[PDB]
Amino acid sequence: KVKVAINGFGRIGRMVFRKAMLDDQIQVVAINASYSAETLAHLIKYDTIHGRYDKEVVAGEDSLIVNGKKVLLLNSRDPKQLPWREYDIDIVVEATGKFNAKDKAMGHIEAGAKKVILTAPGKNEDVTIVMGVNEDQFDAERHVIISNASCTTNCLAPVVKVLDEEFGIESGLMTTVHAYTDLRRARACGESIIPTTTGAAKALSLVLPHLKGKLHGLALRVPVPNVSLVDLVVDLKTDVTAEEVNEAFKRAAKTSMYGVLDYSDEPLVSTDYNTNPHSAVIDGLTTMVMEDRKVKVLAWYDNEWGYSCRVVDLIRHVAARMKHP
Amino acid sequence: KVKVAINGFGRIGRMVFRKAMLDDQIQVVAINASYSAETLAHLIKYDTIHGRYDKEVVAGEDSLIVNGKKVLLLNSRDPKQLPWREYDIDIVVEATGKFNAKDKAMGHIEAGAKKVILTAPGKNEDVTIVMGVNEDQFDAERHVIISNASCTTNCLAPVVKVLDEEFGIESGLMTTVHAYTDLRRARACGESIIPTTTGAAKALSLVLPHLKGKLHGLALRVPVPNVSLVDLVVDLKTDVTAEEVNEAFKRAAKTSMYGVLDYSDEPLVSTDYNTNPHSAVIDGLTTMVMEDRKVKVLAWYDNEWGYSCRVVDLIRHVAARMKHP
Amino acid sequence: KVKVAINGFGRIGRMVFRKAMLDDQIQVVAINASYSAETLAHLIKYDTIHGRYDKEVVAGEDSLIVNGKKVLLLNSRDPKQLPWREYDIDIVVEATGKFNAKDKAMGHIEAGAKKVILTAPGKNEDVTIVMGVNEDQFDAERHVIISNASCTTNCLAPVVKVLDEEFGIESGLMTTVHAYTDLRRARACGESIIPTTTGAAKALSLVLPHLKGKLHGLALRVPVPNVSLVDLVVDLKTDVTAEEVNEAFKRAAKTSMYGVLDYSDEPLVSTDYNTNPHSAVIDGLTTMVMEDRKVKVLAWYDNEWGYSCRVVDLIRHVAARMKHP
Amino acid sequence: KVKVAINGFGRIGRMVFRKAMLDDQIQVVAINASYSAETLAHLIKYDTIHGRYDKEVVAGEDSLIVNGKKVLLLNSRDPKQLPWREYDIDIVVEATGKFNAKDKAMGHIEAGAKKVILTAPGKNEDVTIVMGVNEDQFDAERHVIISNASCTTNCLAPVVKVLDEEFGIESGLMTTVHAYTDLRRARACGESIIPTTTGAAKALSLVLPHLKGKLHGLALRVPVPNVSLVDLVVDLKTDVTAEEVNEAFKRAAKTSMYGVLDYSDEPLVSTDYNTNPHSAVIDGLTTMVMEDRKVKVLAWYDNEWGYSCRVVDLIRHVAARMKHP
């Protein structure tokens, strides 16, 4: 079983831990976090977004017992002090965010870990991966620090990939309607629509390089707790109807992007996609086409759960290629 | 002074009443509503969206005393029973919504009112007006039932008019991010992003006829109390930069669309536009241009206050043309 | 297996159906609702509060296939037209609310059902039951129309019962802080704290008659989607400490009120009690005692899930006593 | 005119500045804040809670021009470096919160200010003042550092004072239902009811010393933007009815507590008290009495605006006693 450590216990770290503890192919050996075992067990068991954890979560002496398995707990702010060599850590998931991600990852390597998965794109990682888009690019012999991009990029890239490979993309603009996770952001008070910048369209370069200059956009932060939406207005290179666009997505969801992209013909609201494991769910009832070429596509994503499921999928892909190069 | 009655005391009726009671050029003679004077005075004085009313509001015997002036109160469900002939009502504002608006308006005419302003587009009105766009079309000798369109159309039409007259519009799609005012709408529970249909782009035909087939869109209802946003992605017929688009809006706001359209270079959030009297406020900091032609424009509007101010402006325009044909 | 029908498919009807379809001791033969099978299947599968249903939900010809079992669907507004005699319906759960509940129940009896469970107290039912408080009072030979009280009464009555039997209650006042489910209620706009009346303290008379005149209170509706709170300030007849009060609750939760009342020493928030099946969960960390006698107790309850679980428990209790009088 | 400086530009500092700039008896000479003049002018002009500022707000070179008057701007983190002696500052309002308030105040004294008003109780101030309760205690010759208590204490103390002086208070418990401004607080996500501690009942000792041991309580943080509520359950020393309690409050509001406490017989919601200048508004329709002695009283307060108005009232009281000892 691949041996994994998790650094940082924010929402992504906790969701990844929840999902990995259910994977019997993965052994979560250790956690490095800022809090005591009792606080960590509380945070694992209870969650205001995804509900209570199904398995038994129990705090012990500098460890957790989760689903019957022991997980060691550490509290090191300098990652190169961690006992990763002594624990034979195969993969560290670096879940403390964007800030100095590459330095932290190198710290984990210096501590004896073999590979690091970053949770942010464009940190000078050896390779940027979006599952369903370019995971084939991972070389276990050449790639040591691997990025899983971001949640919005994990939604945007498969959608855009389907569109470009079926119809060709001329150019497009997008709005990502973002749940909660710049004077505008600082004056929020959790009550307003807030326009901000987004980096998902630029991060698209890392996984679909032939497409930069073609897409850009902004974010609208809205006061919903979780679940976000990509609103993409894109011009295609060939004539389409809404039904043809939806059929391309429907076919990708059942084949090449199975488990990553899904397609829905149901009249759902954003809350219905809470704890959905897909990277993107096309809302088939809203697809629009103006003058056969200008296409509006709406894609739902749980900006926490889908990304964490992709992180676990990536752990499994990397581990398989580590044992069988 | 032009003599006005208001039918219906929902949020639009109450906001229009608040604004008209401040206009010394307008005499609000009467109100027809479903509640007693005490309840109406409560609803006039207090408002969870726009705050407490500034003037003294007092309930009397089947009347209100507001800002020192008496307003008669009626409770007729059939508008042709109203004493509009006996009160010399010049204009009735029909504020009970879209349902059977033309029948209600004819009822007010049969009761003796001279003109009716509907608060919804496409009700077979004699003319559809958006102030700043086509108010010149009103003929006091030929037009008896007049529509002020809708709040979203009052935002979209001036923006689109500036764009078309300065640069020409090829085609475009829009999202209106709507505050609160179909299985999706029924399953809301006030907590989700809800995609729905919108009729603002189609209602554009009534005030800018040369532009239909060129624009369509959808709505995203989000749980904010008030203030909404038009997110327009439009292709233009000539090369532009973001600065040139913003300068066109800035020039229209200070001249041809003064008081109707405004332009902001400040980093504001949606709540900062609460009780803003403009039909649309361009957010200059978010304007984007892809490949010199594909333009993203964001326009804020208080979907209640701006529309009600336009209703009062229209009352004044119609009354001026009634006295001086 | 006891044969059950459900009348009305609001949130309580749907939650009860979800829970009963999992109970292999209960056969849900039929549903009477206002919508078609496709809409009902949508509403069963998806829920903005409690998430997606775990089992396969599928719509057929005037029926549903849920978890592999067929459920017949009817659309009768007059309950005495229903084929309950032909289906051998043992128990009808009347889930259309308070309005004319007894008339509806009699209609179900006239249609051939043997017993009816109302979802509201004080409707001239033969007996009012709160599980854990007085279910022993049900007589299968004398009681035909049975009430499960209300969600707030199902929280308040076990708490008050523990307090009265351990320490004696002199008098008390309560506030129920209520999630969303009178000029104040009509002016809401989903954004305010709204004081209203509550009938839970009066409904206490029906299940704990020796206690009326001793308790009354009000409600504060707050804009949270689900999960509510009883804030009880009660004077006791003997000296206590906070620890003794909490120990009384802790002992009741593990014995006489097992499955109905629970006790928590964890620092949780309201959202952590979403889809909790208990009628009440004492928040042990907030219990307060002033001058040894005046006690503040806080009790969480999911105002939907706990009540629906109690409805299913009551179905099982009634059915057991029907087969073994 | 009394010369005032404001230290700290959080919400209380900004609201106090807004109110003081309207007072022609007060000269706001300077502000010490963490941001540039342009950012400060933005924050003064726009506010997501209380709306846009009425007066002209303009940023100049290390100054603001507000309502036509110039206000100097400083950016000193050490208050004893401020030029208060050179500006003849009479009163500094210390609006950076509870943390090290007395040290900051002494710093302002060392810089040359004559008096300091703290915005938190129990900081070893020379005197704690609640306007309407004990402002008579201020001695301009003996008191140099003055506390205006807290917003919740400014609501609780006048209510409790009326009750104790009219009927006598035996003991009581309270809940303060608090808008947004401990594992529970850290796991919020702005969506839950959160029980926390409150210090308002203990701070009552400072302004009504004969009453400690008699009152204590907790807070329930609820996701409303502004406006909070005190829910007080108190036993009195003499028999009362709800009408007598409400009449005591009504008489205090029109006499001894004019401008501080108000009384409402209207069915309002919390949002209707936004930007209300009173310290407390009794909700007369919810007052309850159990067994002639146990009284429930609900008191609304804008936890920002009322407190800031009290701060300005205190500035005026202190200045009057400074010039006329």
XYZ file of N, CA and C in Angstrom, chain C residues 196-301:
318
model
N -41.924 35.645 17.292
C -43.279 35.178 17.032
C -43.769 34.395 18.242
N -45.021 33.965 18.166
C -45.599 33.080 19.159
C -45.132 31.647 18.923
N -45.199 30.838 19.976
C -45.029 29.398 19.854
C -46.117 28.711 20.665
N -46.529 27.532 20.201
C -47.491 26.716 20.909
C -46.929 25.460 21.533
N -45.602 25.330 21.642
C -45.012 24.105 22.171
C -45.240 23.972 23.672
N -45.172 25.087 24.400
C -45.370 25.031 25.844
C -46.808 24.671 26.182
N -47.768 25.192 25.412
C -49.162 24.805 25.608
C -49.392 23.356 25.196
N -48.798 22.929 24.080
C -48.926 21.533 23.678
C -48.326 20.589 24.712
N -47.424 21.087 25.565
C -46.920 20.279 26.675
C -48.041 19.724 27.548
N -49.172 20.434 27.643
C -50.288 19.969 28.466
C -50.755 18.590 28.041
N -50.688 18.307 26.742
C -51.280 17.082 26.227
C -50.479 15.855 26.633
N -49.172 16.003 26.839
C -48.328 14.867 27.174
C -47.816 14.912 28.606
N -47.789 16.082 29.241
C -47.397 16.217 30.646
C -48.403 17.138 31.318
N -49.593 16.622 31.635
C -50.697 17.518 32.025
C -50.454 18.250 33.334
N -49.777 17.624 34.301
C -49.490 18.223 35.602
C -48.565 19.426 35.522
N -48.197 19.876 34.327
C -47.166 20.889 34.175
C -47.682 22.154 33.505
N -48.978 22.247 33.221
C -49.424 23.457 32.554
C -49.622 24.584 33.560
N -49.542 25.811 33.051
C -49.389 26.983 33.876
C -47.973 27.233 34.332
N -47.103 26.229 34.237
C -45.731 26.331 34.704
C -44.757 26.785 33.625
N -45.080 26.595 32.347
C -44.157 26.928 31.271
C -44.871 27.689 30.166
N -44.193 28.699 29.626
C -44.646 29.383 28.424
C -43.427 30.032 27.785
N -43.604 30.548 26.576
C -42.460 31.098 25.874
C -42.841 31.716 24.549
N -41.808 32.008 23.755
C -41.964 32.598 22.432
C -40.924 31.993 21.503
N -40.989 32.366 20.231
C -40.045 31.892 19.236
C -39.264 33.068 18.677
N -38.010 32.814 18.333
C -37.191 33.741 17.564
C -36.806 33.004 16.290
N -37.438 33.362 15.181
C -37.059 32.804 13.893
C -35.782 33.493 13.417
N -34.763 32.699 13.105
C -33.485 33.221 12.627
C -33.160 32.602 11.272
N -32.462 33.314 10.393
C -32.235 32.793 9.028
C -31.141 31.735 8.973
N -31.421 30.576 9.564
C -30.603 29.388 9.337
C -31.493 28.365 8.641
N -30.954 27.551 7.730
C -31.812 26.668 6.923
C -32.556 25.611 7.725
N -31.853 24.959 8.646
C -32.432 23.895 9.451
C -31.676 23.836 10.768
N -32.210 23.035 11.695
C -31.725 22.864 13.066
C -32.133 24.064 13.907
N -32.824 23.783 15.005
C -33.374 24.777 15.902
C -32.911 24.474 17.320
N -33.264 25.377 18.232
C -32.745 25.353 19.590
C -33.832 25.777 20.566
N -33.981 25.026 21.653
C -34.818 25.423 22.778
C -33.913 25.998 23.864
N -34.193 27.235 24.274
C -33.457 27.939 25.330
C -34.409 28.057 26.514
N -34.247 27.179 27.500
C -35.191 27.051 28.600
C -34.575 27.625 29.871
N -35.278 28.573 30.489
C -34.925 29.133 31.789
C -36.008 28.697 32.768
N -35.678 27.754 33.650
C -36.660 27.095 34.504
C -36.176 27.128 35.949
N -37.089 27.392 36.881
C -36.783 27.282 38.301
C -37.124 25.877 38.782
N -36.215 25.274 39.539
C -36.428 23.930 40.057
C -36.831 23.982 41.529
N -37.313 22.850 42.031
C -37.814 22.770 43.397
C -36.764 22.290 44.387
N -35.532 22.066 43.940
C -34.463 21.633 44.824
C -33.138 22.158 44.286
N -32.168 22.295 45.188
C -30.876 22.870 44.832
C -30.111 21.938 43.901
N -29.510 22.512 42.858
C -28.742 21.751 41.884
C -27.480 22.529 41.542
N -26.546 21.835 40.901
C -25.444 22.449 40.181
C -25.590 22.114 38.703
N -24.860 22.852 37.860
C -24.883 22.568 36.428
C -24.479 21.129 36.151
N -23.477 20.632 36.882
C -23.009 19.266 36.684
C -24.095 18.250 37.025
N -24.892 18.514 38.065
C -25.952 17.577 38.433
C -27.055 17.548 37.383
N -27.421 18.717 36.852
C -28.404 18.789 35.771
C -27.911 18.005 34.558
N -26.660 18.258 34.160
C -26.093 17.559 33.013
C -26.011 16.058 33.257
N -25.742 15.637 34.498
C -25.676 14.207 34.790
C -27.056 13.563 34.718
N -28.094 14.275 35.161
C -29.453 13.768 34.984
C -29.767 13.556 33.504
N -29.412 14.530 32.663
C -29.646 14.356 31.228
C -28.810 13.209 30.662
N -27.542 13.122 31.069
C -26.645 12.078 30.586
C -27.168 10.692 30.940
N -27.734 10.545 32.139
C -28.272 9.254 32.549
C -29.561 8.932 31.805
N -30.421 9.934 31.589
C -31.637 9.683 30.818
C -31.315 9.288 29.379
N -30.293 9.911 28.784
C -29.944 9.632 27.394
C -29.470 8.198 27.192
N -28.850 7.601 28.206
C -28.321 6.250 28.090
C -29.286 5.194 28.601
N -30.440 5.594 29.130
C -31.382 4.629 29.684
C -32.808 4.917 29.238
N -33.573 5.606 30.091
C -35.012 5.738 29.883
C -35.356 6.479 28.595
N -34.466 7.334 28.098
C -34.767 8.096 26.893
C -33.790 7.776 25.770
N -33.228 6.568 25.805
C -32.300 6.119 24.778
C -32.937 6.206 23.396
N -32.230 6.850 22.465
C -32.724 7.055 21.120
C -33.603 8.273 20.934
N -34.097 8.868 22.014
C -34.966 10.038 21.950
C -34.218 11.297 22.356
N -33.592 11.261 23.527
C -32.790 12.353 24.045
C -31.327 11.935 24.051
N -30.453 12.858 23.663
C -29.017 12.644 23.718
C -28.375 13.795 24.475
N -27.128 13.586 24.874
C -26.371 14.569 25.628
C -25.005 14.738 24.987
N -24.579 15.988 24.832
C -23.322 16.307 24.174
C -22.472 17.187 25.078
N -21.216 16.789 25.274
C -20.213 17.624 25.920
C -19.236 18.216 24.906
N -19.588 18.194 23.624
C -18.707 18.691 22.584
C -19.093 20.107 22.177
N -18.116 20.916 21.761
C -18.404 22.287 21.291
C -18.843 22.309 19.828
N -20.125 22.045 19.612
C -20.673 21.979 18.269
C -21.477 23.235 17.953
N -21.746 23.422 16.668
C -22.634 24.471 16.202
C -23.892 23.813 15.646
N -24.890 24.645 15.338
C -26.203 24.122 14.968
C -26.127 23.201 13.755
N -25.298 23.553 12.768
C -25.218 22.763 11.541
C -24.741 21.339 11.805
N -23.987 21.125 12.886
C -23.529 19.790 13.251
C -24.659 18.869 13.684
N -25.856 19.398 13.923
C -26.991 18.572 14.301
C -27.940 18.323 13.135
N -27.562 18.735 11.926
C -28.368 18.443 10.749
C -28.468 16.938 10.548
N -29.694 16.458 10.320
C -29.990 15.033 10.159
C -29.616 14.233 11.406
N -29.685 14.863 12.573
C -29.579 14.108 13.818
C -30.936 13.498 14.152
N -31.003 12.198 14.461
C -32.310 11.541 14.641
C -32.937 11.734 16.012
N -32.241 12.356 16.958
C -32.785 12.508 18.296
C -33.847 13.605 18.332
N -34.734 13.504 19.324
C -35.726 14.552 19.545
C -35.094 15.789 20.162
N -34.040 15.601 20.951
C -33.377 16.692 21.646
C -31.956 16.259 21.953
N -31.014 17.193 21.839
C -29.641 16.966 22.272
C -29.270 18.092 23.226
N -29.087 17.752 24.502
C -28.634 18.714 25.497
C -27.228 19.180 25.147
N -27.029 20.496 25.114
C -25.696 21.088 24.982
C -25.124 21.230 26.384
N -24.305 20.258 26.796
C -23.839 20.220 28.173
C -22.915 21.361 28.549
N -22.245 21.959 27.568
C -21.283 23.015 27.863
C -21.936 24.357 28.162
N -23.235 24.513 27.911
C -23.895 25.793 28.129
C -24.809 25.796 29.346
N -25.010 24.648 29.996
C -25.908 24.579 31.144
C -25.456 25.538 32.235
N -26.396 26.328 32.755
C -26.072 27.317 33.776
C -27.059 27.239 34.927
N -26.583 27.568 36.126
C -27.417 27.589 37.320
C -27.148 28.883 38.077
N -28.204 29.639 38.338
C -28.179 30.862 39.124
C -28.885 30.589 40.447
N -28.183 30.855 41.553
C -28.726 30.717 42.907
C -29.300 29.320 43.150
N -28.607 28.306 42.619
C -28.882 26.891 42.869
C -30.216 26.398 42.309
N -31.076 27.304 41.832
C -32.435 26.926 41.447
C -32.812 27.324 40.020
N -32.318 28.463 39.532
C -32.692 28.966 38.210
C -31.735 28.392 37.170
N -32.243 27.543 36.282
C -31.417 26.734 35.395
C -31.666 27.158 33.955
N -30.586 27.395 33.219
C -30.644 27.576 31.777
C -30.139 26.305 31.106
N -30.962 25.763 30.208
C -30.669 24.547 29.461
C -30.910 24.830 27.981
N -29.981 24.394 27.138
C -30.064 24.551 25.692
C -30.200 23.176 25.057
N -31.210 23.000 24.205
C -31.465 21.706 23.582
C -31.573 21.874 22.073
N -30.677 21.217 21.338
C -30.714 21.223 19.881
C -31.726 20.220 19.352
N -32.321 20.546 18.206
C -33.092 19.540 17.490
C -33.154 19.891 16.013
